Amino acid sequence: YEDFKCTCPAPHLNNTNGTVMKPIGCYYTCNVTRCTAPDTYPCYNLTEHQAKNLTTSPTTLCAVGNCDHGICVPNGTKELCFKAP
């Protein structure tokens, strides 16, 4: 069944807003197949500094955006991100 190609969960980050969880990008991997987030789906757009130095504590200010053609287009709003344990 090729219907399971992109029906797998994807890693998401937590926040401190009380808002929905948002991924690091618009692309996610299931098995070996590359999947893309739905268009306008909310996401974080981070720099490489914030990505390699991201921790489990609310310490990073992330640019929030929406998915367009697989790209996280920032919308100007910001949030505190951390990886869930």
């Binding site: 797998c8 739905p38 789906y41």
Partner: protein, 64 residues
Amino acid sequence: PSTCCLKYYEKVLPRRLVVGYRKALNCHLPAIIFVTKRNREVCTNPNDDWVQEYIKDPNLPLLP
């Protein structure tokens, strides 16, 4: 619980294939994640009737 779903599995999953379920509701697409025999996590819409009848089953448990 740190995962969210981006596409729903719209077909009906045969019950004999599923071993358990998880909930991912603090997401833009709230989903019930069924775990299959081969450890596959399958995203489903929580409002679908088949998904809900599966969760009501006491022999189909929520998985930590």
